[PDB]
């Protein structure tokens, strides 16, 4: 398959890894901080997803330095991964239009 499709698949796998790792690390970073809510794994996984998609409801978020650092990694991974899917779609469309034009 073409590069853009391979890259998209890879990006998806990497994002899943980051969501899982981010959830584990977020709990690790936040427990020990009075008042923190990102402290159990199931909801931390949910938090990682709404952060990677940049939805950010505000129901859960990190209060510590390391939790916030983990958060930035999750954000960047989500933004870049979805952006890469967009880039792959554009490449697919560009190629199809070239053909349709007989170029």
């Amino acid at each position, epitope marked *: 398959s073409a590069l853009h499709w391979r890259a998209a698949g890879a990006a998806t796998v990497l994002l899943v890894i980051v969501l899982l790792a981010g959830s*584990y690390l977020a709990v*690790l970073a*936040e427990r020990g901080a*009075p008042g923190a809510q990102l*402290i*159990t794994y*199931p909801r931390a996984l949910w938090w990682s997803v709404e952060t990677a998609t940049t939805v950010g409801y505000g129901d859960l978020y990190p209060v510590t330095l390391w939790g916030r650092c983990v958060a930035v990694v999750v954000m960047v991974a989500g933004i870049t991964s979805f952006g890469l899917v967009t880039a792959a779609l554009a490449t697919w469309f560009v190629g199809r239009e070239q053909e349709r034009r007989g170029h």
Partner: antibody
Amino acid sequence: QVQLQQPGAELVKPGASVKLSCKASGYTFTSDWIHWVKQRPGHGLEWIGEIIPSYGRANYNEKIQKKATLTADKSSSTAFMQLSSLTSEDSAVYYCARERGDGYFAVWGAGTTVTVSS
Amino acid sequence: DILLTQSPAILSVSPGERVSFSCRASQSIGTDIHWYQQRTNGSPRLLIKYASESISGIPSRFSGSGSGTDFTLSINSVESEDIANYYCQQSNRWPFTFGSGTKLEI
């Protein structure tokens, strides 16, 4: 079978210290946290602290004087709590409990009755 | 730190009657409350998780309800084996905390 095994009792001279143990069996996951809870005779349950074996990180109750130090041995699947410079105020039953990272203590040890006396 | 208030501290009920234990949290904690039973000379035993979820091995007699700041542990038709101390515990915010406990008397 018993998931958490703790010694029945420990006698400690005032000022001295002791190391309590909690041997765990059954399913074990990287998300497991081992907690320690203190209970004075006739009184309620007081959270002491927690440790995550898969990483070695430990957190403690900030409201009370820190008497404990938590450690864990992955190979022997054993968690330890070092209580130091104890006084009669430290005499109590100390329970270890297992939490699967989801907030509740699914299982508890039988508890170790610690007595601080000469 | 979240304060869990269990009042009254002692509940007196007649055999077979329905009883309800109260646990009030100092702030809203959704349904992140769990209940434990501790009989004389025994270790705590998990009865209900996340305010209303059943635990395998626990008599259907036990149920839980509530969300926010007010929670209830109910026993339908109490019997002798139910005599013990009951504690609530929250896991919504760090650190986890316990209520002061309620004793069931028959």
